[PDB]
Ligand binder design. Sequence first.
Ligand SMILES: C#CCCCCCCCCCCCC(=O)SCCNC(=O)CCNC(=O)[C@H](O)C(C)(C)COP(=O)(O)OP(=O)(O)OC[C@H]1O[C@@H](n2cnc3c(N)ncnc32)[C@H](O)[C@@H]1OP(=O)(O)O
Ligand SMILES: [Cl-]
Length: 382
Amino acid sequence: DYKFWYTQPVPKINDEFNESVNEPFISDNKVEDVRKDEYKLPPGYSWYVCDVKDEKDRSEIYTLLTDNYVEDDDNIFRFNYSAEFLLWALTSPNYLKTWHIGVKYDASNKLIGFISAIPTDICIHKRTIKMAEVNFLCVHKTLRSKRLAPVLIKEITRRINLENIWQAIYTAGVYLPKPVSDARYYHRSINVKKLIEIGFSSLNLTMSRAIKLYRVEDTLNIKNMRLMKKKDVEGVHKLLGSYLEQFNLYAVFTKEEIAHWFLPIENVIYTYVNEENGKIKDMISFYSLPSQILGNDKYSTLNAAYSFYNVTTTATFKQLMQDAILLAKRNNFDVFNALEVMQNKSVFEDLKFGEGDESLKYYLYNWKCASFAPAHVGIVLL
Ligand SMILES: C#CCCCCCCCCCCCC(=O)SCCNC(=O)CCNC(=O)[C@H](O)C(C)(C)COP(=O)(O)OP(=O)(O)OC[C@H]1O[C@@H](n2cnc3c(N)ncnc32)[C@H](O)[C@@H]1OP(=O)(O)O
Ligand SMILES: [Cl-]
């Protein structure tokens, strides 16, 4: 039915546009006309201003998401973003505190809903648009299917429009009207035995053969790959910024955004560079996103690395991503996850990735344009 979404400026399920269409559904919007009142909540609920730089507010967000956020289709793993990860994800350059929106139940003073956005410049089919990047929509499990999600979406839309921003980018595992692209997840086992025992992976292929199949030589193809430092920011900016221009959808990073999104933070973000004759010629990056293991008496956490942005000019992309796997292994990750975006799909078979069973759909709000294969996607959202 899509009874909420069809009231919104998004494509209808049957909409199809060719390359000559690349523009808003609704243009000529006016800040002075935006609703100035918060949207009404059901009785006993209230909007809450989450200060993610406040330890208590940030821990309430963490707890809400730890207990209630995204689970896999088989309900065995739930994402477990850390408090430090949330800080990094939500306080990117020029972030707005008004875009970190909580809902509390007054009687218990408990956070039961959350939605967030950060500002980012998005190039879609070579047009660069100031957008809001919406993430972490969460409604407490006990309150599902009470139509709270539309109210959260409408309220953050209002707050984004008050900054004279009228487009948004978001991803979801569920199908909504209507993806601009759709990218399957793929998974490269690192700690084989653990993945088998938690039912992430399967045997048939004995235990010892599986361990041998996925073994990793502890030698880099690019021997001087090293952790990124502050002096590397301009070089990473130039290397990644030039690389991303080939894609139909990417973020246009400023130097300040490069510093924020790529300077290493232990157990949050890992970036490695290859410096040659002064110049950053290759880079590898992946972020940490563990999953809670629901109902396993031996293991409580899956330590997963997620491919972020990877560029090579002195090796093949397979060689580069082989080093990415090694580096994730060296930092104690159990599995290395990646989407079939950018050049990634070309190395999945040779590097012994397995196809997952879920995909990530890319969405734009108030924008109509042609869809495209995920190899043309040049952005990875958290
Ligand atoms: C300009 C500016 C624009 C700014 C706004 C742009 C639009 C942003 C849309 C949201 C983007 C989300 C990005 C993500 O962060 S991804 C992660 C999704 N997080 C989870 O998976 C956590 C686990 N899960 C939950 O916490 C809840 O299930 C949710 C996701 C809150 C859903 O709430 P529940 O209580 O089920 O559903 P209710 O409150 O009755 O609302 C029904 C309507 O809602 C739609 N919907 C459902 N899931 C959605 C979802 N994930 N994103 C958007 N919409 C969603 C759904 O179709 C339906 O509407 P219809 O009637 O079908 O038109
Ligand atoms: Cl080495």
